[PDB]
Design a protein around this ligand. Structure first.
Ligand SMILES: Oc1cccc2ncccc12
Length: 115
């Protein structure tokens, strides 16, 4: 809205990002998928995403509404479901992050709406 302030919103996004990273207990989404180990990754995945990149986007003022932030989170999840077979831990880790992280995201968006 007209009066919504930037700094409390960024503080909220930082806290939310930390809470989401806590759900990724193996830290498999902490840094970009290592393209040197996965040379076919970009054949399947058009926009890689990870929590370090999200932190850099946050601090570069690229996230100005909650959708901007949640869309990149959803890329982390959807890219991982798309690339990895269902019988892998990586696939299940994306399911777990979607489920547990969705709860973090709903409460955070509610706080943003009060701003
Ligand atoms: O190394 C990784 C971490 C998280 C997700 C991945 N998805 C495909 C290939 C490698 C991955």
């Amino acid at each position: 809205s007209m009066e919504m302030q930037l700094t409390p919103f960024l503080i909220l996004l930082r806290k939310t990002l930390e809470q989401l990273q806590e759900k990724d207990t193996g830290n498999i989404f902490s840094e970009p998928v290592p393209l040197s180990e996965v040379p076919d990754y970009l054949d399947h995945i058009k926009k890689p995403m990870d929590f370090f990149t999200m932190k850099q986007n946050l601090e570069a003022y690229r996230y100005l509404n909650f959708d901007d932030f949640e869309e990149d989170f959803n890329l982390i999840v959807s890219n991982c479901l798309k690339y990895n077979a269902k019988d892998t831990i990586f696939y299940r880790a994306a399911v777990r992050l979607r489920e547990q992280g969705g709860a973090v995201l709903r409460q955070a968006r509610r706080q943003a709406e009060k701003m």
